[PDB]
């Protein structure tokens, strides 16, 4: 006997289904409701003949050892008699697991069989149990078995007092999160934000209402400053700027932007300024041209950085098309715009600024709510997204972009599953994790959630599926790297009386931290490293064993799929005279080594990261 597999993310499809005379849609077998059915198509006449099939794509490779069929309770029509059950891993080749005849009664029917690996299970209904008509119906279908064991492992869920739809890592193993004026909904311009800080050492959460900056910071641009503060601008109070200080856990008011905006992207530049572009979610539709903030001057317009060349072809128009730009600081101090629009751009922020076409992202379509992650110097991985923000099929496609000497784009391997609303996380070994999202982008839904993250390795350009998480993470979810090398994932929903809010998170331990058996792997240690350093300097780092590879991982803020802060700079060490002492040479180019808080990870020869130290780089 096996227990039911979780059904999060499953998608049902069928040979045929009724919609005209009743709601007989295939999806109805997955809703938990005994009163909603898949029904084979019978109208308009003529009715679709037997046999009929119902296919479930689980979105992951489970071990399947049985199937439970719950017939409708209201009449006998369409009870399945003769059945077959097939399994597939690739969706192309099918293996027969079971064949039989179910009795003509209302009992839930269970079929068991030897466990089989499968992503897809198909039920074929070959007869109607009482030969009453050419019909098949099913109220619910469950699949019995066990989820994959690894790679990687997930913590139990972590309680939050709000949906953490924005997050930022702080020094000292703490995570700042916030929602909006409410823990569970958004709306208006009421100048209040609910926040919650998770202490990753103890699990304690500290909740605070932030009213002193007159800013509801839902839907903002975010970035980390050189001095460690977090600058948040726009969103529900579209003109506002607020600054968080991790040393005192307080916010301070900043200066207003010139034009109000929301769902824009903000990026810290080589000079420690913050550039912003786009964002028609709030503050008015369109004309969300570039501006740049300095600590001494506040926000100033960039007259020669118009928004126009970043717009996608979103069917929703201006409200959506300037949202969530994939912006990166680049060598020499420009900003590179990698998407989501097909067209990419180089942006200068000096003087009045400039914009220059960088050509298209090869043959990519628009990829709104896709991810872009800087996993090495001048090296970006982009993946997922959909051409529309709303009601749009997502892609599995992924493209690399090398901006070291010009712009070189190449399609790389597809992910195993399409995603929109996922999050991308650079890991210190150079791999990039993608987590969450869903197959068909519809804000505030968990339908078609992608439950298994995938890890892309630049050395192979392949995606490997990770063990699945428990909670779906779609619109309004976040994920980011932690200083111990694990990954926080959380949020989703923020839709009030909706049923899809997730006031929680889960922590993923990636494969590089585990022994084969899932226990914690022994890791290298940093014994001594400087708390601060300046671009272009050499630093000396002491470890508990001989290490030659280190990774500087810039700390992150993230919301609405956007994380302009994270980036990996790998460095090779030169061994010196002491007890595992080594010298690292920091790049002088602050367009690459953007000033701010970094996690310094020692990487052993097995690819195992130390716990990072924090280094504030100027």
């Amino acid at each position: 006997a096996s227990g039911p597999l979780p059904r999060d993310g499953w998608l049902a499809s069928a040979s045929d289904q009724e919609t005209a005379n009743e709601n007989g849609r295939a999806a109805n077998v997955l809703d938990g409701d005994a009163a909603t059915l898949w029904h084979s198509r019978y109208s308009p006449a003529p009715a679709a003949p037997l046999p009929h099939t119902l296919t479930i794509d689980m979105g992951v490779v489970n071990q399947v050892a049985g199937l439970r069929y719950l017939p409708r309770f209201d009449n006998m029509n369409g009870r399945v008699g003769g059945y077959s059950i097939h399994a597939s891993s690739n969706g192309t080749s099918w293996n027969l697991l079971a064949r039989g005849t179910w009795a003509d009664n209302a009992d839930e029917k269970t079929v068991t069989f030897a466990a089989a690996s499968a992503r897809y299970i198909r039920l074929t209904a070959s007869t109607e149990a009482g030969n009453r008509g050419p019909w098949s119906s099913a109220a619910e279908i469950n699949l019995l078995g066990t989820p994959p064991k690894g790679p990687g492992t997930w913590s139990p869920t972590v309680n939050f007092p709000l949906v953490p739809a924005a997050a930022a890592l702080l020094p000292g193993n703490r995570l700042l999160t916030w929602s909006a004026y409410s823990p569970i909904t958004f709306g208006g311009e009421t100048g209040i934000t609910q926040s919650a800080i998770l202490d990753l050492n103890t699990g304690a959460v500290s909740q605070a209402e932030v009213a002193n900056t007159g800013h509801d910071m839902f839907c903002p641009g975010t970035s980390l400053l050189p001095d460690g503060r977090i600058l948040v601008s726009g969103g529900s109070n579209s003109e506002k700027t607020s600054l968080f200080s991790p040393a005192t856990n307080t916010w301070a008011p900043g200066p207003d932007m010139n034009v109000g905006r929301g769902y824009q992207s903000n990026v810290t530049t080589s000079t420690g300024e913050v550039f912003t572009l786009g964002g028609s979610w709030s503050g008015g539709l369109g004309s969300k041209h570039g501006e740049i903030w300095s600590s001494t001057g506040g926000w100033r317009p960039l007259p020669d950085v118009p928004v126009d060349s970043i717009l996608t072809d979103d069917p929703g128009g201006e409200f959506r098309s300037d949202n969530h730009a994939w912006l990166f600081s680049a060598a020499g101090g420009r900003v590179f715009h990698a998407g989501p629009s097909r067209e990419m751009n180089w942006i200068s922020t000096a003087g009045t600024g400039s914009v220059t076409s960088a050509g298209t992202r090869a043959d990519s379509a628009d990829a709104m709510n896709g991810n872009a992650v800087m996993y090495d110097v001048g090296k970006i991985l982009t993946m997922g997204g959909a051409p529309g923000y709303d009601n749009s099929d997502a892609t599995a496609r992924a493209y690399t972009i090398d901006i070291n000497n010009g712009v070189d784009v190449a399609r790389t391997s597809d992910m195993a599953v399409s995603r929109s609303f996922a999050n991308g996380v650079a890991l210190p070994d150079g791999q990039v994790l993608v987590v969450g999202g869903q197959a068909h982008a519809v804000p505030f839904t968990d339908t078609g959630a992608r439950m298994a993250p995938e890890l892309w390795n630049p050395a192979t350009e392949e995606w490997t599926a990770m063990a699945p998480m428990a909670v779906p993470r779609t619109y309004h979810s976040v994920a980011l790297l932690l200083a111990d090398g694990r990954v926080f994932v959380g949020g989703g929903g923020l839709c009030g009386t909706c049923t899809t809010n997730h006031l929680d998170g889960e922590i993923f331990t990636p494969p590089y931290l585990l022994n084969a058996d899932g226990s914690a792997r022994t890791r290298p240690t940093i014994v001594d490293a400087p708390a601060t350093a300046t671009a272009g300097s050499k630093i000396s780092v002491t470890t508990g064993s001989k290490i030659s590879k280190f990774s500087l991982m810039r700390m992150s803020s993230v919301t609405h799929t956007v994380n302009t802060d994270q980036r990996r700079i790998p460095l090779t060490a030169t061994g010196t005279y002491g007890n595992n002492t080594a010298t690292l040479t920091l790049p002088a180019d602050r367009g690459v080594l953007v000033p701010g808080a970094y996690m310094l990870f020692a990487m052993d020869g097995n690819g195992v990261p130390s716990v990072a130290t924090t280094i504030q780089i100027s």
């Binding site: 938990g32 009163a35 719950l70």
Partner: peptide
């Protein structure tokens, strides 16, 4: 399972 009933 749950049920929303019939209308």
């Amino acid at each position: 399972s749950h049920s929303s009933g019939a209308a």
